């Protein structure tokens, strides 16, 4: 998991705004992984999602309806997840 | 109000190069390219202008 996610983030950074064309393929799976992954890596996924959103800016639009729900479901007042969510 | 200077002429200079996106344009889904309540894509590059 970790190496694959890091590779995807690197590719998006290297491509620049050209990477927007890949959102229909990546996001529908990435969010599902967040939904079903183990807690040990969910925090990492939130941090990488943060960076991904930063890279794609206003094109994230159609996915916010689900991103906000994932953010609310896991906001359990645990200091670590709170810091990660606040940065996100 | 003795100073009654008035506008006599208006110059309309348009650079609406329909069909061409400058390289610094971010596109496209929310672009809402509606100008003077016209959507240029339904008419073509000359009629729309």
Curated annotation (Swiss-Prot), chain A:
Q: How is it modified after translation?
A: Autophosphorylates when part of mTORC1 or mTORC2. Phosphorylation in the kinase domain modulates the interactions of MTOR with RPTOR and AKT1S1/PRAS40 and leads to increased intrinsic mTORC1 kinase activity.
The subcellular localization recorded is:
Lysosome membrane; Endoplasmic reticulum membrane; Golgi apparatus membrane; Cell membrane
Positions of disulphide bridges: none
The UniProt entry annotates HEAT repeats at 22-60, 62-88
Tissue spec: Expressed in numerous tissues, with highest levels in testis.
What family classification does the UniProt entry report for this protein?
A: Belongs to the PI3/PI4-kinase family.
Disease linkage: Smith-Kingsmore syndrome: An autosomal dominant syndrome characterized by intellectual disability, macrocephaly, seizures, umbilical hernia, and facial dysmorphic features. Focal cortical dysplasia 2: A form of focal cortical dysplasia, a malformation of cortical development that results in medically refractory epilepsy in the pediatric population and in adults. FCORD2 is a severe form, with onset usually in childhood, characterized by disrupted cortical lamination and specific cytological abnormalities. It is classified in 2 subtypes: type IIA characterized by dysmorphic neurons and lack of balloon cells; type IIB with dysmorphic neurons and balloon cells.
Q: What function is annotated for this protein?
A: Serine/threonine protein kinase which is a central regulator of cellular metabolism, growth and survival in response to hormones, growth factors, nutrients, energy and stress signals. MTOR directly or indirectly regulates the phosphorylation of at least 800 proteins. Functions as part of 2 structurally and functionally distinct signaling complexes mTORC1 and mTORC2 (mTOR complex 1 and 2).
Subunit description = Part of the mechanistic target of rapamycin complex 1 (mTORC1) which contains MTOR, MLST8 and RPTOR. The mTORC1 complex is a 1 Md obligate dimer of two stoichiometric heterotetramers with overall dimensions of 290 A x 210 A x 135 A. It has a rhomboid shape and a central cavity, the dimeric interfaces are formed by interlocking interactions between the two MTOR and the two RPTOR subunits.
Instruction: Cite the domain annotation text.
Output: The kinase domain (PI3K/PI4K) is intrinsically active but has a highly restricted catalytic center. The FAT domain forms three discontinuous subdomains of alpha-helical TPR repeats plus a single subdomain of HEAT repeats. The four domains pack sequentially to form a C-shaped a-solenoid that clamps onto the kinase domain.
Q: In its UniProt entry, what is this protein called?
A: Serine/threonine-protein kinase mTOR
Q: Which residues of the full protein are shown?
A: 968 to 1055 of 2549
From Swiss-Prot, chain B:
Section of the entire sequence shown: 51 to 99 of 1335
Specify the protein name. Regulatory-associated protein of mTOR
Give the encoding gene's name.
RPTOR
What lineage is this protein's organism placed in? Eukaryota, Metazoa, Chordata, Craniata, Vertebrata
Q: How is it modified after translation?
A: O-GlcNAcylated by OGT upon glucose sufficiency, promoting interaction with small GTPases Rag (RagA/RRAGA, RagB/RRAGB, RagC/RRAGC and/or RagD/RRAGD) and subsequent recruitment of mTORC1 to lysosomal membranes, leading to activation of the mTORC1 complex.
Origin species, per record, is Homo sapiens
Family of this protein:
Belongs to the WD repeat RAPTOR family.
- Compartments, as annotated in UniProt: Lysosome membrane; Cytoplasm; Cytoplasmic granule
Its quaternary organisation is: Part of the mechanistic target of rapamycin complex 1 (mTORC1) which contains MTOR, MLST8 and RPTOR. mTORC1 associates with AKT1S1/PRAS40, which inhibits its activity. mTORC1 associates with DEPTOR, which regulates its activity. mTORC1 binds to and is inhibited by FKBP12-rapamycin. Forms a complex with MTOR under both leucine-rich and -poor conditions. Interacts with (via TOS motifs) EIF4EBP1 and RPS6KB1; interaction is independent of its association with MTOR. (Microbial infection) Interacts with vaccinia virus protein F17; this interaction dysregulates mTOR.
Tissues expressing this chain: Highly expressed in skeletal muscle, and in a lesser extent in brain, lung, small intestine, kidney and placenta.
Q: What does this protein do?
A: Component of the mechanistic target of rapamycin complex 1 (mTORC1), an evolutionarily conserved central nutrient sensor that stimulates anabolic reactions and macromolecule biosynthesis to promote cellular biomass generation and growth. In response to nutrients, growth factors or amino acids, mTORC1 is recruited to the lysosome membrane and promotes protein, lipid and nucleotide synthesis by phosphorylating several substrates, such as ribosomal protein S6 kinase (RPS6KB1 and RPS6KB2) and EIF4EBP1 (4E-BP1).
């Amino acid at each position: 998991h970790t190496m694959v996610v890091q590779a995807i983030t690197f590719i998006f950074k290297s491509l620049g705004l050209k990477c927007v064309q890949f959102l229909p393929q990546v996001m529908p799976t990435f969010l599902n992984v967040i939904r079903v992954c183990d807690g040990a890596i969910r925090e990492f996924l939130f941090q990488q999602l943060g960076m991904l959103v930063s890279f794609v800016k206003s094109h994230i639009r159609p996915y916010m309806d689900e991103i906000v729900t994932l953010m609310r479901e896991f906001w359990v007042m645990n200091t670590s997840i709170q810091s990660t969510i606040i940065l996100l | 109000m003795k100073d009654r200077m008035k506008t006599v002429s208006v110059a309309l200079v348009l650079c609406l190069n329909v069909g061409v996106d400058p390289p610094d344009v971010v596109k496209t889904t929310p672009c809402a390219r509606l100008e003077c309540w016209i959507d240029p894509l339904s008419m073509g590059p000359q009629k729309a202008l």
